[PDB]
Structures are given as structure tokens and as C-alpha cells.
Amino acid sequence: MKVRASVKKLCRNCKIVKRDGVIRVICSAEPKHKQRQG
Amino acid sequence: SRVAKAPVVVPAGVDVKINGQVITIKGKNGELTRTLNDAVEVKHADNTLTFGPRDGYADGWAQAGTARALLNSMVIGVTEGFTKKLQLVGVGYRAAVKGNVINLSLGFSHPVDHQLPAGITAECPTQTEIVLKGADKQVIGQVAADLRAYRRPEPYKGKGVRYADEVVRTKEAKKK
Amino acid sequence: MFTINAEVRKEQGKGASRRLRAANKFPAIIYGGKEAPLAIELDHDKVMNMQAKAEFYSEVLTIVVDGKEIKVKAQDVQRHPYKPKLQHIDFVRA
Amino acid sequence: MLQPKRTKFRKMHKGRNRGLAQGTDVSFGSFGLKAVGRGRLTARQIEAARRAMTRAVKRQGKIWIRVFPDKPITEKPLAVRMGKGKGNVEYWVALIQPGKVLYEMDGVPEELAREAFKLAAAKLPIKTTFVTKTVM
Amino acid sequence: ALNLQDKQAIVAEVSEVAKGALSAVVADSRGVTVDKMTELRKAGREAGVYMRVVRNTLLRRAVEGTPFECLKDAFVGPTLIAYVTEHPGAAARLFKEFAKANAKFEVKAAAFEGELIPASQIDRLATLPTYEEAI
Amino acid sequence: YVKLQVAAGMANPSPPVGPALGQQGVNIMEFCKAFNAKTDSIEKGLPIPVVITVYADRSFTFVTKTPPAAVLLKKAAGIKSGSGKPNKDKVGKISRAQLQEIAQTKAADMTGADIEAMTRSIEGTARSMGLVVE
RNA sequence: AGCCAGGAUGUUGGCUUAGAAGCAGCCAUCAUUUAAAGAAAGCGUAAUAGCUCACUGGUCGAGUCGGCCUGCGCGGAAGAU
RNA sequence: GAUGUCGGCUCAUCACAUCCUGGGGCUGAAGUAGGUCCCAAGGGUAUGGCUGUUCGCCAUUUAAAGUGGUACGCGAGCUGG
Ligand SMILES: [Mg+2]
Ligand SMILES: [Mg+2]
Ligand SMILES: [Mg+2]
Ligand SMILES: [Mg+2]
Ligand SMILES: [Mg+2]
Ligand SMILES: [Mg+2]
Ligand SMILES: [Mg+2]
Ligand SMILES: [Mg+2]
Ligand SMILES: [Mg+2]
Ligand SMILES: [Zn+2]
Numbered sequence: 001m002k003v004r005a006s007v008k009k010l011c012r013n014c015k016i017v018k019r020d021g022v023i024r025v026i027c028s029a030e031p032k033h034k035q036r037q038g
Numbered sequence: 039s040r041v042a043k044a045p046v047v048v049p050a051g052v053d054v055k056i057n058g059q060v061i062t063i064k065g066k067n068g069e070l071t072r073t074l075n076d077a078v079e080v081k082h083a084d085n086t087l088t089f090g091p092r093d094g095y096a097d098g099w100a101q102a103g104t105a106r107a108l109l110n111s112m113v114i115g116v117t118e119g120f121t122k123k124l125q126l127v128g129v130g131y132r133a134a135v136k137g138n139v140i141n142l143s144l145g146f147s148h149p150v151d152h153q154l155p156a157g158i159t160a161e162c163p164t165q166t167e168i169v170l171k172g173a174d175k176q177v178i179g180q181v182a183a184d185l186r187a188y189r190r191p192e193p194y195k196g197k198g199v200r201y202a203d204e205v206v207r208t209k210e211a212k213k214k
Numbered sequence: 215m216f217t218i219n220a221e222v223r224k225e226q227g228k229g230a231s232r233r234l235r236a237a238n239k240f241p242a243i244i245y246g247g248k249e250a251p252l253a254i255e256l257d258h259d260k261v262m263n264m265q266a267k268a269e270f271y272s273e274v275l276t277i278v279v280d281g282k283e284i285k286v287k288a289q290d291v292q293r294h295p296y297k298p299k300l301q302h303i304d305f306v307r308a
Numbered sequence: 309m310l311q312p313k314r315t316k317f318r319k320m321h322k323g324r325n326r327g328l329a330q331g332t333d334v335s336f337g338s339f340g341l342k343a344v345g346r347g348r349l350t351a352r353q354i355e356a357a358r359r360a361m362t363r364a365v366k367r368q369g370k371i372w373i374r375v376f377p378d379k380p381i382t383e384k385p386l387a388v389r390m391g392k393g394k395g396n397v398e399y400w401v402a403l404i405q406p407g408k409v410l411y412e413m414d415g416v417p418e419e420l421a422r423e424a425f426k427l428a429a430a431k432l433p434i435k436t437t438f439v440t441k442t443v444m
Numbered sequence: 445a446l447n448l449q450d451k452q453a454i455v456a457e458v459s460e461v462a463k464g465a466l467s468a469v470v471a472d473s474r475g476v477t478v479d480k481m482t483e484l485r486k487a488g489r490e491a492g493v494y495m496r497v498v499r500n501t502l503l504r505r506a507v508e509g510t511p512f513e514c515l516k517d518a519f520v521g522p523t524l525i526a527y528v529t530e531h532p533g534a535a536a537r538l539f540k541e542f543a544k545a546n547a548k549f550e551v552k553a554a555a556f557e558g559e560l561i562p563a564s565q566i567d568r569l570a571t572l573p574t575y576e577e578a579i
Numbered sequence: 580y581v582k583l584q585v586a587a588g589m590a591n592p593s594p595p596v597g598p599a600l601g602q603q604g605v606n607i608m609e610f611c612k613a614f615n616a617k618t619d620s621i622e623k624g625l626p627i628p629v630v631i632t633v634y635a636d637r638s639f640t641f642v643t644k645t646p647p648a649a650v651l652l653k654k655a656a657g658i659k660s661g662s663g664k665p666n667k668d669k670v671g672k673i674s675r676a677q678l679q680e681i682a683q684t685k686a687a688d689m690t691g692a693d694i695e696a697m698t699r700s701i702e703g704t705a706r707s708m709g710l711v712v713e
Numbered sequence: 714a715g716c717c718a719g720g721a722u723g724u725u726g727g728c729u730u731a732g733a734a735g736c737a738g739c740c741a742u743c744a745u746u747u748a749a750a751g752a753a754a755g756c757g758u759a760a761u762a763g764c765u766c767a768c769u770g771g772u773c774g775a776g777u778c779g780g781c782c783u784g785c786g787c788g789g790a791a792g793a794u
Numbered sequence: 795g796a797u798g799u800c801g802g803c804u805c806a807u808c809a810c811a812u813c814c815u816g817g818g819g820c821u822g823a824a825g826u827a828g829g830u831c832c833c834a835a836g837g838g839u840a841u842g843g844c845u846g847u848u849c850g851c852c853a854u855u856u857a858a859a860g861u862g863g864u865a866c867g868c869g870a871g872c873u874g875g
Contacts, residue, residue, distance in 0.1 A: 001819035295407030478721030497748035
């Protein structure tokens with residue numbers, strides 16, 4: 001999981017999702033692309 | 039919205055009981071009961087089920103959409119039924135059913151025993167295959183996740199409890 | 215043919231102009247010829263969309279000031295320092 | 309790194325940085341990077357931004373730098389008390405008012421100019437906007 | 445992205461060749477590789493046939509000008525046209541061997557004499573010989 | 580099922596065909612002499628392509644194809660090796676009569692309907708190898 | 714948007730390399746059968762294979778896409794009795 | 795018209811920017827062992843050689859030998875290098 005102030009889509013398979021008031025990047029193709037704003 | 043506006047066809051021999059926000063859908067395969075959100079207004083009429091937002095409720099269409107999707111798979115439930123298929127991969131990994139309990143050999147010191155809930159039923163066509171059957175799409179999905187949880191597919195050989203339809207990406211170990 | 219709708223200005227100066235811009239409008243002037251200059255007010259969004267078309271600065275425009283039609287040409291434009299907005303337009307009578 | 313070749317005087321009063329900019333239009337290129345905020349750009353910041361946009365366009369096209377760091381900025385070293393003269397000149401800045409076209413570019417497609425300008429914007433202490441040239 | 449200027453142009457090309465040709469075959473071309481296609485596009489130009497995959501909305505428009513205004517109900521599912529310009533027949537036989545040899549698709553409906561030919565009675569234009577047989 | 584290019588009068592060495600076709604399940608001596616018995620008509624010093632179709636019983640059937648487009652453009656222009664940077668460095672020259680000579684042989688493998696269609700397909704193989712039409 | 718089908722030929726483009734066959738690099742980037750298919754957006758192979766995208770035909774049946782001027786919010790946000 | 799200074803002893807108390815132990819994501823994570831990030835302050839967190847030293851270097855331990863605040867905590871509590 002990457003925790004940073006600036007979360008972005010990294011590839012086409014990346015998806016931005018707001019779970020529990022926290023912007024997140026979920027990705028089907030690369031687990032390295034997993035992000036949490038914080 | 040597009041989901042909510044789409045009506046759910048209630049077939050022959052399927053009973054729909056609607057006491058306010060409580061819906062009981064009875065068929066050949068079983069009896070499922072659900073409580074809809076107060077923003078959903080469910081109308082019976084003919085051989086269909088129609089969903090729509092309730093006045094003064096902000097997320098009405100989002101709520102009716104969910105209600106629709108649920109009641110559809112409730113009907114498909116008490117009629118056709120749902121099937122989840124799991125397959126055990128790895129030397130020594132075996133499974134067997136003894137009534138309402140799935141016995142599992144998954145590489146631990148102690149053998150795993152999993153108590154199935156009301157409605158979910160399992161059968162083992164092989165020592166390495168588990169087939170689950172039930173009416174509640176949520177419960178069957180839960181049980182299959184819990185059984186997978188014991189030994190999740192490892193990324194280096196694919197060993198562990200996997201879903202039949204599951205694509206298990208593997209990888210090479212560090213070079214040197 | 216670009217058609218612009220305008221009102222004559224009831225007020226002049228810093229105060230009145232800033233007030234216009236606050237109301238999604240802007241001042242502009244029509245000068246040239248024997249006729250005395252005419253201080254007018256324009257809808258911001260309308261003239262902003264027009265001026266985006268290159269042809270606006272080359273073509274002969276028609277300004278409808280209380281029924282009367284005025285054939286003009288865009289002389290000079292005062293733009294907002296950093297926003298995509300218009301502050302003032304000079305229209306010369308053609 | 310930009311800096312005046314000579315100066316009438318070494319040091320300059322702090323002054324103030326009030327008002328709106330002069331040089332608010334793309335005057336040489338097709339595209340520009342315009343200042344939306346107020347502040348000081350240092351010669352090092354200007355260079356960092358210029359390098360970033362130059363890499364971006366793979367040295368194709370032409371770049372103009374509409375700003376010049378001509379204000380000397382003095383600094384008093386550590387463990388030095390107040391007074392005893394004005395500090396020594398350490399670096400050079402260009403005062404920026406909102407509206408200033410900072411850089412200009414031509415000879416490259418809009419999509420690339422927009423990229424190159426996003427990359428340079430990241431190195432600057434003030435908020436910027438992309439601007440295109442206009443007919444009057 | 446097909447523009448209307450380009451949609452009208454495709455309607456025009458297939459409207460022109462509609463009048464000119466004699467017999468036409470409307471068929472499915474699903475699950476067949478381009479290797480087998482470039483093969484049926486070779487033996488198609490040889491037999492004096494015009495091969496085209498045309499959008500079914502676009503085809504219902506370039507066939508409204510008749511005599512194929514019974515090929516309407518054949519513009520449901522993927523459609524390829526075999527317009528036989530030089531000598532009637534050729535394709536109605538070229539396709540029948542391609543259908544049996546590849547097992548994929550079924551061949552929809554054929555058109556000749558300005559009359560409807562169903563999926564069962566395509567044996568009429570498949571047994572016909574040459575022009576060029578009467579002598 | 581593998582695609583290879585073997586010489587007109589040569590098929591046997593270990594570095595090009597050896598462990599390339601022999602790893603699947605094809606006889607190294609049965610194919611090497613049956614291929615050269617049919618490619619005896621094909622001129623000396625011309626790479627000719629051959630496609631292999633193998634079954635579950637280790638058996639094989641091959642259909643010989645016409646020489647490649649980048650292969651026939653080297654003998655017509657008078658070059659052993661092409662250009663390292665095509666359309667930047669010129670290595671030879673081929674006339675409009677030589678272009679139609681490569682296409683009239685390649686007609687069995689070409690997708691084109693007309694002579695002009697097969698000619699333009701060889702025009703592209705020439706530009707992307709450094710050769711200029713003169 | 715989803716789902717069904719294709720995503721080809723010359724050709725394994727040329728150079729290089731034990732091999733480079735769209736997929737280490739470097740250079741060019743046309744042409745054909747075309748409904749459409751980059752001399753190929755990424756993963757995979759010792760190199761091939763094999764999987765998918767750009768693009769296009771079918772199904773569906775009414776909306777859908779993302780820039781601009783703006784109001785109010787969200788994350789960015791760790792300290793000692 | 796006086797708020798005793800460094801270090802040690804004794805005795806502590808808080809923060810968490812966590813040293814160990816606990817949970818957990820990614821890894822260029824096969825295992826063992828690491829790297830990095832998130833959650834977590836409940837408890838635990840060396841003895842010596844040299845030097846007034848705090849520090850530091852060194853020896854040998856340990857699961858670990860945390861980082862800081864408390865008048866750089868603590869002389870109407872001790873010491874006085
Ligand atoms: Mg949670
Ligand atoms: Mg005032
Ligand atoms: Mg006193
Ligand atoms: Mg913390
Ligand atoms: Mg780090
Ligand atoms: Mg503690
Ligand atoms: Mg240790
Ligand atoms: Mg103290
Ligand atoms: Mg005392
Ligand atoms: Zn991703």
C-alpha cells in the first residue's frame with residue numbers, strides 16, 4: 001500500500017474509489033499501484 | 039437508476055409477500071426474507087416487481103437500484119439456485135463433507151473444520167474440489183470467501199483454496 | 215453575422231463598472247464618425263463565446279442598442295489579467 | 309542562471325510587490341505560462357523550470373523567458389546580531405504580479421506545450437495558468 | 445468513428461452495385477479467421493463477385509431502392525454480401541462449400557429475380573451451371 | 580507447428596534448424612531430404628520458406644512457399660546485406676521492370692487482386708530496407 | 714457501458730545478436746486483403762508460441778463524454794500533566 | 795533588595811516521529827532472513843573498559859539496548875569529577 005498526499009491513476013486498470021471518506025486507488029493489474037491518501 | 043427502472047419478473051409458483059418494507063420471496067428452492075431501505079417503494083402488480091424512489095429521500099434512485107438487484111437474485115435464488123465451485127491446489131491439500139461440516143486438510147498441524155450455515159450445503163466430487171449450493175447469493179459468497187481465507191492462493195506456485203473461475207497470476211522468485 | 219445585444223449605460227466610472235462585472239456584464243464603448251461616443255453594457259457570457267471565434271475581430275459586427283442597429287468593428291479589447299474574462303471593448307463605427 | 313551582468317548599485321531596498329502585471333499577453337510564441345499568484349521567482353527556480361520544459365519538448369521548438377531576476381536579495385549569516393550594516397547579496401529574484409507571462413513557446417503542438425508547462429509549473433513557488441496567443 | 449458524409453458515401457457505393465449485380469448472398473461471418481477470409485476474398489474476385497461487410501442499418505437504406513427490398517429481414521445479425529455482377533450464380537456456390545468446410549456460421553438469405561430465398565431452399569442457385577452451358 | 584526458412588540446396592546443420600524443429604517431435608533426417616528433393620527446381624543461393632504441420636503421432640506434412648520480399652530485393656539490386664538505417668542511407672537501385680519480376684513469382688503468397696496491387700506491396704519492403712526506386 | 718466475433722497478409726520488415734519472429738536496442742514506419750487491424754499500447758518465451766489492447770461488424774435501446782466560470786465541503790494535518 | 799551551572803545517583807512522569815513484542819499492505823517477498831510503508835504507547839527496553847563527561851569509540855550481552863518533552867525533569871533529595 002502506498003500512503004501519500006497525492007494519489008493518482010497509474011495505469012488503465014487503476015480505479016479511484018472513496019471508501020469511508022478516504023480517496024484510494026484500487027488496481028486489478030498491478031498490486032504496486034495500490035494507494036491511500038494520507 | 040437503469041437497474042431500478044428495469045422490472046423483476048416473478049415466475050410461476052413464486053410467492054411474493056410484501057408487508058411494508060419487508061419482502062418474503064418463497065419458491066421451490068427455499069424462502070428468503072429482506073428489509074429494503076426506507077427510500078425504496080416496491081410495487082407488486084402483474085407478474086413483475088417494480089422499484090422506485092420514495093418522496094423526500096435524497097438517495098432514492100441509488101437505493102431502489104440496490105433493492106431491485108437484490109430482489110432479482112432473491113427470485114433467481116428460490117428458483118434456479120446458486121453454485122460456487124472451489125478447487126484445492128497443492129500437495130496434501132484435501133477436503134471432505136460430513137453433513138453440515140467441511141473437513142479441510144490445508145497444510146496446518148490441526149485439520150480445519152468449517153461449520154456451514156443454514157441454507158448452504160456442500161458436496162465433494164473430488165478430494166480436491168468443493169461445490170457449494172444455496173438460495174442466498176450473499177451467504178454462498180461469504181462461505182466461499184471464508185473457505186478461501188484458510189489458504190489464499192500463494193503467488194509463487196498457486197497453492198491454496200481457489201475459486202474455479204479464478205485466474206491465479208504467479209511470479210518468479212528473486213533472481214539470486 | 216455576429217449580433218450583439220446592448221443597453222446604454224445609466225452610470226459611469228470605477229464604481230459602476232466594477233458593479234457591472236460583478237453582475238456578469240461589462241462596459242464597452244462605440245466611437246468614430248460624426249456621432250458622439252455611445253457607452254454601452256454587454257452580457258459577459260454572450261460576447262465571450264463570440265470573441266472565441268477568430269472572425270469576431272475581422273468581420274463587421276452589429277450591435278443592437280434599443281432597437282437601432284450599429285455596424286461596428288472590434289477596435290481594442292481589455293482582458294482580465296489572469297482569468298478567461300473580458301473587462302472592456304472598444305468598438306469603432308464601420 | 310540569470311543575473312544582471314552589471315548594476316548601478318549592489319544592494320536594493322526590500323520594497324513592496326503590489327499591483328497587477330505588465331506583459332500579460334503571449335507576445336512572441338503561440339503558448340505561454342502565466343502567473344495567477346504574486347511572489348518572487350529566484351534565478352534557480354527560473355532555471356529549474358526552463359530545464360524541465362526544455363527536456364519535455366526534446367529541444368524542438370523555441371522558448372522565451374519573459375522574466376528577468378534583477379533584484380538582489382541580501383542575507384545575514386548565522387550567529388550574527390542585528391545591525392552592523394546591510395547583509396551580503398546571496399541570490400537574485402524577479403518580482404511577479406498576477407498576470408505576468410513568465411515563459412512562451414512555439415514550434416510544438418498544443419498537447420506537448422501543455423505537458424512541458426505542467427512540468428515547469430511544478431518547480432515554481434506561485435500558481436500558474438496555460439495561455440494561448442490572441443488576435444488583439 | 446463513422447461521420448454522416450462517410451455513411452452516405454457507403455450507402456451510395458452499395459446502392460450503385462445493387463442495380464448492376466444479378467444474384468446476391470447475405471450471410472453470417474462470425475468466428476472465422478482473416479486467414480480464411482482473405483481466402484474467400486481471392487476466390488470471390490475470380491468468380492466475378494463483390495464481397496462486403498456492411499452495417500445492417502446502412503444496408504436497409506441501400507436496398508430500399510429495390511429489387512432486394514425483401515432482404516430486410518436478413519439484416520439481423522452479422523451480414524456479408526456477395527453481389528454477383530459478372531454471370532449470375534458464382535457466389536451462391538462459392539459460399540455453400542465455405543459453409544460446410546468451416547462449420548462456423550449458417551448463411552442467412554439469398555436474392556435473385558427480386559424474390560425471397562429462405563435458409564432451406566438455397567439449393568436453387570447452388571446447382572445452376574455456367575452462361576456458357578446452353579451451347 | 581513452427582515456421583522456418585531453409586536454403587534451396589541446404590537443410591541439415593545444427594545452429595539454424597537443429598534444436599529449433601527437433602524439440603517438438605519432428606524427424607531430423609526424414610524432412611531434411613524430402614524438402615531438398617522438391618526444392619531442386621529452385622535456384623542456388625535463394626532462401627525458400629517452409630511451414631510444418633505436425634500431429635499427435637509425430638507425423639508431418641509441409642507446403643513450400645515462395646521466397647521472401649526482403650530476400651528477392653537483395654539479388655535484383657546487387658546487395659548481400661541491407662541498410663542499418665533505411666531511408667537515411669542508400670545501398671542499391673531497382674527499376675519498375677525488376678519490381679514486377681519479384682511480384683510475378685510472389686503471386687501465390689500475395690493478397691493483391693491486380694499486378695499493381697502486388698507491385699506496391701514490394702515497394703514498401705524496398706523503402707524500409709534502404710533501397711531506392713530508380 | 715457491458716456481452717458475442719475478428720484483430721489478418723507481404724513478413725520471421727531492415728540492421729544487430731547464440732536468438733530479436735509487433736514486444737533488449739537502433740532506424741524507417743509504407744503497402745495489400747479490407748468491416749477493421751499500430752510494420753504494433755502492455756504482460757509473457759532461451760527465441761517462437763500464447764493472452765489482451767488500439768480499430769471494426771453484431772447485440773442492446775436512450776442518452777452519453779469532459780473541459781470552462783462559480784458556492785460549500787474532503788484528504789494533505791504528528792507532541793509532550 | 796539572588797530563579798544554583800554541566801555530568802552522575804535516587805525517583806520518576808508524559809509524547810509517539812515505535813527500539814522489541816502484536817496486527818497488516820507492497821517487495822526487485824521461494825523458505826529462513828531482510829527492505830519499505832500503515833495501525834498500535836499495553837508492557838518491556840544491557841553490563842562493563844577509557845574519559846568529569848552528556849556523547850562517542852571499544853568489549854560482551856539482549857527480544858530490544860527507541861527518539862524526544864518535563865527549569866537541556868529531579869542540590870529546602872544526595873554527590874562535587
Ligand atoms: Mg475500514
Ligand atoms: Mg473606491
Ligand atoms: Mg525577594
Ligand atoms: Mg503512529
Ligand atoms: Mg521511504
Ligand atoms: Mg512504552
Ligand atoms: Mg540486535
Ligand atoms: Mg536540568
Ligand atoms: Mg544539601
Ligand atoms: Zn494500475
